[PDB]
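Q: Give me the 3D complex with zinc ion.
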Amino acid sequence: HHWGYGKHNGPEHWHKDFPIAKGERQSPVDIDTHTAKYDPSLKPLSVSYDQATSLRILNNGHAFNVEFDDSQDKAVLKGGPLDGTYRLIQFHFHWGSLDGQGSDHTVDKKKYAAELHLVHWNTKYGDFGKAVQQPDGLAVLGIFLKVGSAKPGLQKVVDVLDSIKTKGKSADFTNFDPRGLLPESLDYWTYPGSLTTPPLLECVTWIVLKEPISVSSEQVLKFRKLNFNGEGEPEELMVDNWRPAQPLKNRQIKASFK
Ligand SMILES: [Zn+2]
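A: Here is the predicted complex, encoded as structure tokens.
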């Protein structure tokens, strides 16, 4: 039936409807820190989110997305390994049922409690829908979350979850600044990959930040209270919405640091 994260429609089944699942540039991957090549030709990232306009938060049945106005160059990413301007369209997270798992990517096989994905699309393609069909159409910034101290900037997000508990619910979500979710350092790893959920298109330039941000136990707790199901359907907690690491195959992970 339709894809999800349960036993019967989980990652191991995806290839039946999305054959690209077994492609050559699938994500996520394990980042082997001793095999990643420091590349001094990589430029520093440029994050300009000062004009970011958030509009809405939505439960789509697999995660929650905070959506932004991408009608103009208001929140963009450039620099790093990228050519051109990438506009922020949305961010969402991947998390676990326990603090020992939840991230998509792993570092030296270590799993994090969650992973934030900031999704950007290449302005040269005019819209998101055309961008996903190109090898360089998307840029996704991945940020690891570990449990420790609370992240003040994530709290406006935690507090609205109650209102979008089930699939298809949405709430107005204006004036949220995504700068409150960045770590202090912008050192990163980069490799060519894909979306980590169906349709798994291989159109992503991944930018994974070396430094994790911390959230409190109580904050991740609230994530685990969401539902995969729609209102009036049997309750399935939204947990473990991450895909296991995929073979690197013929790809190199480059590091912006040493
Ligand atoms: Zn994601």
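A quick observation: The chain has one domain: 1-258.
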